[model samples]
Target: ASVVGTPKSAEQIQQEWDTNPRWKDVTRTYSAEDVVALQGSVVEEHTLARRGAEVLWEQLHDLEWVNALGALTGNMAVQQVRAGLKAIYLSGWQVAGDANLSGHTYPDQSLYPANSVPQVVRRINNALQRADQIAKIEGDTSVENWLAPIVADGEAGFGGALNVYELQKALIAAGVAGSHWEDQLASEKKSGHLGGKVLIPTQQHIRTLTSARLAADVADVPTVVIARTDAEAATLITSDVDERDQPFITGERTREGFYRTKNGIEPCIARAKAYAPFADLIWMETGTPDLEAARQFSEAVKAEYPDQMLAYNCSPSFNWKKHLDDATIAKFQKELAAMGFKFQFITLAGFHALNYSMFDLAYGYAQNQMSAYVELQEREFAAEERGYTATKHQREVGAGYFDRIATTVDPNSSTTALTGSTEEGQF
Candidate 1:
């Protein structure tokens, strides 16, 4: 304490450490290859799958789930990005409706079928700018969002309305972690999709499927793209749709490339290998719970590329199981997990079907019983983890965003602004 200090105490010590290169972490001197790549680790595949999710993850900014995630616009986007708030998702109809972002109207799609190339680019750019905002505020590069978009239906919108090329380009530009390209070979079903999904010849669609990689090249972002297949539909349906040129592989191919009119699988394997050069993951729509066949197909594909990462869909089409007992479903899961399939998409469609059905079943009887806990049947738990229900008020409905501004605004600002209690709705 008695020592005299200079213009800056200890600043000299800090400068010496900086100038001395030997002070660097000792581990840095030895280069190492990722062990996962060398081992049986499917870490690469999981990482690739999470790219899109992580983009959303980082962008979510620690809030609970938001409703109109990619759907919201401009300040709406900012509403979530800048705040420690949750995010929301938008449906395809929402994107196509063409609404002003100012009012949160008209514009966006659900998961995948709900969007276009131009629109997707806008989504990417909008979120990215906000990502930039987040980076600036937080001042950290290590933490970032994955920003994935699921390109629904048919492999090759490659860009434009269904442009796969442009879709990949836009997502890469946003530095998305990854995106998915569907194998349902046809236009959006209701929007006059020509012929509906044709089960396009894999050889043909694989080219377009490769576009995500090309787009990554253009944007200089190494993005992961999952090539999703709808071949299971062919197995599901007896007759081919008029739109199909190849129809689902009516037969399987031998390892030697010969076609087997029945039970042959070489063709699927070949197609998967064809896609392997460009794709990071293979999303197989286990069209049916025909676990044995699905297992065979997965085995064949991985045989070609043992390094391949497989994906499974917990599709709600359990009725696809045709109401087979739970033991059977467990069997499918059991066989599938052991199969090379690594990534499993939580079946959104299936889960929701279960969700609502349980709600009606549970609430229906409870309503008769007349209970908050029962009789009246229960209502929504709405756990933004009890966000607004407890002490936090304006924090709900996205006011967390404006909270910062509220404090810095003119002292004349509505400092006393408050919301009335949430009254239950009446029919």
Candidate 2:
């Protein structure tokens, strides 16, 4: 109704705000002066990031056990959106191994820089945006949730309080919808290694999560903060400042007179109870696929905060076949959902899945060469019929998009005239 180049006036901006559901959430949390103080700093309003957070919040409210396959690549995201996945998990472990910034493989030791995980989130979002644009051009509605919420690993804050704050801001700006910071010490996090883990004091970990939340508030993005505790198997604590941790603190005192805590669900539950107010989800990293332990933790935490949502790491660390039968493995996620574990994720799946796929393809190609490759193509073709949209690389990667843009810029350009039709051939 107004001029194209003109900015919206105060009344128009207020009218837009009056209709925004996010405004209510913001006003509920902050006063007029508080929001004014937030506005003092500069940041972009990442609407899609907030949209993903709200979608995830709805899933939690309904007790829907949303599952995310750990994704390490943009191609994985593109395919997942095409397959109708509404959420994606970016595991630091998977990213460390496959997508490290140093371009070298490393274990999940929190050795990667803080921005490494966010970089992957940005890449995945870019792919989604590209796919969405192409979908608009082709009148395709198959890719329903292009900007699926990304729940990434934040790996113990990567340092102290300021480090956590900076990392949270980076994640929000990079389009992460959710991120989990752990109770384990950043310097001592050995998630994928064969070693006993150490934890910070319960109150200290709470402060870590609080700092992350503060950062999100400043940025005005509701990035779901998951408070992760590795206390289920952790044997040492750097300090016992919080009296809540005193009950679990045991064994011979160290040179500093600090005792190591016993490894059990009690310590994790205690921390979860303390972290309930600070985090959106309380996650306990378990060493086994024990449903009973999960039930106990959920019962204890929800006893205090009934509406508190929980997250579970259905990790690859445990051998699924060895721990449970096929039937139990299949129903494990559903069982947890009933127990109030609203967000369940198989962390590091992307690394294992890609490795398996590459090996399966390579083994046969080594044995039969072009025939094996062609057979793989046949398999992809079969999958495409069943809804694998990435088989047509030309459209998925937006080659046709550039062709359209080229024709727009130059009617007589060879870019349009010389190129073959995307509809033809195996593509």
Candidate 3:
């Protein structure tokens, strides 16, 4: 575990590196000796990626699934764990929507900085680490869901193969548990828009995934790679270099002949098949919330690769009340779990929850003034949930954390530890 050990030969370092179980499942074009000779034998096992991959494979084997919720901020992430969610998702759409700059906001067009999502991963993980320390000091085990893995949105890798490779390196360095890479084109990167979607050829996409996997292995972390296909709704393709894509190409003949093809579940399955080897999980994106389509996709993919794990985006774009009843909605995720989907997540849960709560509070305040604010506080105080950190806003955000840091810095520092109070009219 010590990187500062006594001088050792490259052969000895390579021997030690080869014994690491983390690299056993990884497919690498180069050997540990190649890596050790350059980067040395110092291996930092990124626990977020390791733990995330562990939880995912565990659920896959157990026929279980995690109902992960999206979080764009540290507060939302902490709240998700407090609410007992075992997984956290850093949604690109949510991050894009919240992309506030000098004064402007942006849409989910892959317009935000490439490092934005990874920054959120680091931010949330840091909060979790700080919260864990606070819980340990206060004997409060409630806010101790620090092990809940975070899966981020690696939207289209933000560019080409080299870009993807570099992006994956950044993701691993930032402590991501996992991240999904989509096949949507760089120029046509639009999520949930139902706008014109264009995919790169099958071979090109495979290479993109290969780049991601290569990055993970080089970094020596088992970062779960989720291969996401938007081919289910794609109308065009960038090329026909891969014959697997030739079947789907249509229109006026090019030098090779075929053109754009309106894709179906078959094409989606084909992409999944092609992607199975390079990815840990296969995700097929669709416009509608159809159980039959999900079943069909699952059956076809699993038929070919029995051990292939699947991920589902319980996308917030669909109005569940219109397509499914309350009872059906309640059981939707469980149904997907039974169909071999081990990682299911509501893609915009945190954003939607934040919006709805803000709207509700705003409406109440507009009509009832202080009475509404009083009601809000009352409910927050009344909740008996063990991990509800919101009740004590100051301490939850890090009043106690900073106090602990101060105590560590100087044992006799005068510090009144702040705590939330339900004192009359405190708001």
Rank the candidate models, highest lDDT first.
Answer: 2, 3, 1
Compute the lDDT of residue 193 as modeled in candidate 2: 32
Highest lDDT model number: 2
TM-score of each: 0.52, 0.89, 0.88
Stronger candidate by TM-score (1 vs 3): 3
Instruction: Report every candidate's CA lDDT.
Output: 0.43, 0.80, 0.77
* Per-residue lDDT over 1-427 for candidate 2, one digit per residue giving the tens place of the 0 to 100 score: 5343333343544454477643332222233344335545345677767877887777666546888889999988878778877789989998788897888788888888778988998888888889888888889887666788889888888889889988888888888898999988888787833465778888788778877877776666667888898888888888877799888877566674446888788888888888887778889988889898899999999998887889988988898899999999989999999998989988978898899988988998999888978887788889986688666777778887888889889878885622776555535
Give the alpha carbon lDDT tens digit for every residue of 1-427 in model 1.
3222212223443443356432221111111222112222221222222344444434323322222233324443433333333322322333444332333433122223323433544564455454554444435353233233332222345233236766555444433455666544333222111222334445445556555555443343334456765544333222232223233335554443423222124444555666665566676554455677767877787777776666565544446547466788666555665675544433333225335666876776576543434422223334334321212323323243343456567646655343332421221
Order by TM-score, highest first? 2, 3, 1
Off by over 4 Å in 3: 1-47, 59-63, 100-104, 253-259, 385-387, 419-427
How close is each model in CA RMSD to the real structure? 14.0, 4.3, 3.8
Q: Roughly what TM-score does model 1 have, to 2 decimal places?
A: 0.52
When summed lDDT is taken over every stretch of 10 residues in candidate 3, the lowest stretch is 418-427
Which prediction has the highest TM-score against the true structure?
2
